[PDB]
Design a protein around this ligand. Structure first.
Ligand SMILES: NC(=O)[C@H]1CCCN(C(=O)CN2CCOc3ccc(Cl)cc32)C1
Ligand SMILES: [Zn+2]
Length: 139
């Protein structure tokens, strides 16, 4: 569990979206595991507009923040699950670090702000769904 709150938007993992998220839907992408829904309250999360590859992510399974080196956003194969079949997830960054199933939604941050949220993991790795290309979140 975890979300990004920027202005009049709420960015969540598409597989964890609730009924209100789909009733106030702005944009969703199964291949990115993202869903953005509208909000009545004014959010203040600063989105990073950068090309960073180092930052800090929040790990609910260890109740700790961790500094990571991560890859540039790309098409990475993800095994089938109870939310999606076997596909290539796009805009996904990988890093060496602890992650377990309840960790989806933990924020990844750099000096410039929010980079993305935990989406995949396993075998001593962590995957983040990037949000830095979505310039409409700010405008
Ligand atoms: N992006 C996706 O398709 C997600 C949707 C459901 C969750 N996904 C998983 O990988 C589930 N899982 C299995 C392997 O061990 C893990 C360790 C950490 C995390 Cl965050 C998830 C998992 C794929
Ligand atoms: Zn940055």
């Amino acid at each position: 569990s975890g979300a990004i709150y920027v202005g009049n938007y709420r960015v969540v993992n598409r597989h964890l979206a609730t009924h209100n998220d789909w009733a106030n839907l702005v944009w969703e992408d199964s291949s990115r595991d993202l869903l953005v829904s509208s909000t009545t309250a004014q959010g203040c999360d600063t989105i990073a507009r950068c090309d960073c590859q180092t930052g800090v992510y929040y790990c609910s399974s260890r109740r700790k923040h961790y500094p990571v080196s991560f890859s540039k956003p790309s098409l990475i194969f993800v095994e089938a699950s109870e939310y999606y079949p076997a596909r290539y997830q796009s805009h996904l960054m990988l890093a060496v670090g602890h992650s377990e199933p309840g960790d989806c939604g933990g924020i990844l941050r750099c000096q410039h702000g929010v980079v993305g949220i935990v989406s995949t993991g396993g075998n001593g790795l962590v995957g983040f769904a990037d949000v830095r290309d979505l310039l409409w979140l700010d405008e």
